[PDB]
Design a protein around this ligand. Sequence first.
Ligand SMILES: [Fe+3]
Ligand SMILES: [Fe+3]
Lengths: 198, 198
Amino acid sequence: AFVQEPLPFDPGALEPYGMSAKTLEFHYGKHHKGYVDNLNKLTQDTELADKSLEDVIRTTYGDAAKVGIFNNAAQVWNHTFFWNSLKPGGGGVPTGDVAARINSAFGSYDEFKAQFKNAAATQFGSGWAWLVLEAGTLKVTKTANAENPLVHGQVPLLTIDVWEHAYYLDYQNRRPDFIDNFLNQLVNWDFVAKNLAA
Amino acid sequence: AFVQEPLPFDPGALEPYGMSAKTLEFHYGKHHKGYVDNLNKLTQDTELADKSLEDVIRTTYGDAAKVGIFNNAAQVWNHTFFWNSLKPGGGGVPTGDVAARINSAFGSYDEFKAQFKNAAATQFGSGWAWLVLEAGTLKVTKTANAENPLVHGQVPLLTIDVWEHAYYLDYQNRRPDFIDNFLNQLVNWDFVAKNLAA
Ligand SMILES: [Fe+3]
Ligand SMILES: [Fe+3]
């Protein structure tokens, strides 16, 4: 069946960098695994058992009869993408082709950071902010709930989860501080670069 | 300006009943006050400064230029309605006209509890569940983000907040347990009866 991808680092390894071991216990151990479980419950009898996360997402998006499958598949994919977007001793500025394309779409890295932070801060309710490639240019986006750039004809490059469970144990109501900490200590530009190259 | 309605009980008084003092500190002290502060920022300039929350909510519903005012006013109203939906030593069964009308619509109080819990448990993302009166009968509804029954031509009687901040410090991912705790130890049937009689 669908299997939860292992975390790309030890679950306590982000604690010096602003994301607690307790957060990883609940967010990866309970929320993310829960989405895998519900995805499996709703697909293992069906034609979608044989299908990639991405294909399940794109197939079931917009289908009023398959909202459960969509929401779970999208969340499974989103919270693998999110863990890959983090690393112990992240932060710093992007280099190489990523940095060049950020400068050309946003003017500078700082101007990207402001737009990315605004997106993440202003998604009202539960959701995600993203760096994406669309029509050969980089863009910052925000999505609601389980939505994700795959359903908007975009290539995802980076995400931050702004569902309250992502940050509430460590920042409570302080989403903006959570977002700053992500940019300052956790963002994984190596992942972004791999995504852009492909 | 708009003033945050005082909590109807001491902020530590729900602790033996499944809602911690810490939760009240953050939820009432920070989240709720924040919405008031934002509502005041966006309205004290204007025509809407003297309006009841209910009137701001109905007036700005659907207005593409006033989403911020809508969301904040709706959340100020929703939180106040939530605190009133709670009491120390709540729970038990409704009586009187509330009970008769629940029996008429749901068949029994236990069936209401099932329907209410289902609604609260399945609102995906951030939102609220409600008992409402509409077209002479009771029903359960759920809403997203800041929406509430006032913009659906329904009279709200009871609510539970299912934004993750409402429960995450006390139950983490365990929303179903949070909802059971509300029904068993917190729901304020007196408030429901007041709302119904009006
Ligand atoms: Fe998450
Ligand atoms: Fe709330």
